[PDB]
Amino acid sequence: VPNEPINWGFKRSVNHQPPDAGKQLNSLIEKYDAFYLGNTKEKTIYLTFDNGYENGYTPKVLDVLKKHRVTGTFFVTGHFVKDQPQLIKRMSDEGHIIGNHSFHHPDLTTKTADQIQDELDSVNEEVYKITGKQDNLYLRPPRGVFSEYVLKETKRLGYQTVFWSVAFVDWKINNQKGKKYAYDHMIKQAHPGAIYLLHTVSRDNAEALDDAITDLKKQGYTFKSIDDLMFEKEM
């Protein structure tokens, strides 16, 4: 209404400057409740993760975040929550934010309002069964696919749609390139206000992250959460 499919994408950050999705996406983003950047006026980075399934490394990622005292926002699917309740419980117990990546991870633009409501509510329902808690409502569309209609409808349901400004190929299981590949991207693409989208399924991703946080802090970056981002802009 319009329900024209749009893929979240952007020219990567260069020279450590925030990237720009274009005047077209920027407008849509403002029109509804959504963002891909935090406060670009300060040297801050916000870490987010997409979690659809487990490959053995999320516990180490949680250990790394705890070590650095950093808060992550984990966008989870129905499958992930049902397959890994203990990890879901650790995210909650250790101060992180659990975001909604939808139950079945469908292309939301192909779903009715009614369906969308169940796709999102069912994830919170299961998370609550596990934690007895419920975070502020954040949504990341599956495959980054959305439309004006999906934005309008999810806003009406109380969700803040969260995109990203830094992402790389750390989700290909048949070609896990190791620590350096991931670490170098996290350093090179860094910029003020950056919202990083990371996966936790690739070989050594936790170690790369540990090194990246260590060196990004050394550079003067501070890591804040998606809740901080929302509250701080509110003022």
From Swiss-Prot:
GO BP, one annotated term: sporulation resulting in formation of a cellular spore
Keyword Iron: no
Residues annotated as site: Raises pKa of active site His: 170
Keyword annotations of the record: Cell wall biogenesis/degradation, Hydrolase, Metal-binding, Signal, Sporulation
Pfam family, one: Polysacc_deac_1
EC number(s) on file: 3.5.1.-
Name of the featured protein: Peptidoglycan-N-acetylmuramic acid deacetylase PdaA
